[PDB]
Amino acid sequence: GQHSLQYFHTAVSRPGLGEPWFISVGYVDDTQFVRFDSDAENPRMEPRARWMEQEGPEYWERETQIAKGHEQSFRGSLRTAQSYYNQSKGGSHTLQWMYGCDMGSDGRLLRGYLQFAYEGRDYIALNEDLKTWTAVDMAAQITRRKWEQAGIAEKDQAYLEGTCMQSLRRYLELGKETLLRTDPPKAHVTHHPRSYGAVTLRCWALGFYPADITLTWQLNGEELTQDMELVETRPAGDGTFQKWASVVVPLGKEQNYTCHVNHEGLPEPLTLRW
């Protein structure tokens, strides 16, 4: 039972076509719950989870306020990164920021994090100590010295260990019936023609939550690690996830194989054969 509260920020310039595109998303575990989009007629922090709908105006006003502050900083940051890297005018550049806190099973802080990317590349990152930074290049180092001078690490550490953790537990409280739920996979194995003497056994895991799942195909104990096709875990769109794993197998010998579904929401590992 591990949790996390993460906020994602993305600023994409678009010269001659408006102010930078700023969008922010907030996540509790594998569930998005808040969002801000600079292009909305009225940019504001808005709920994206049903359990965040009983928060009242004050809450959003505040968040909307903070989001805008950051939005402005990102406008200036874009222009700044543009200079540090001396990029010509008229170009599009992205600035990304993601920070959050992981909460261990014991309910205590597991660790915090905060990092930036520019043009999709690691730029600057707060180290696991939450006191020092990792600057990727001379440009980043400039930012590093500035943040060191402003004692920003200290501020982030405080937020990451405190406020971040406080709101997480709190949002977990709000989202109880869904955030703490753990919808187990609906697993079945499907059969598929492939060749004249070989079929594809596809092991499906449906409607589970959280997204973390383990699918493996095996033949008499031995895991068929190399013959296994795995699809990236995907959102069904309704809050749960899907995933499957397949193996190429000779016709007539399907029954011999077995797939093992492992997921928090299961009393114990599943074993499917066909």
Binding site: G69, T80, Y118, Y159, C164
Partner: peptide, 9 residues
């Protein structure tokens, strides 16, 4: 809740 600390590059 969003962190209030501004990070200017």
């Amino acid at each position: 809740i969003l962190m209030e600390h501004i990070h200017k590059l």
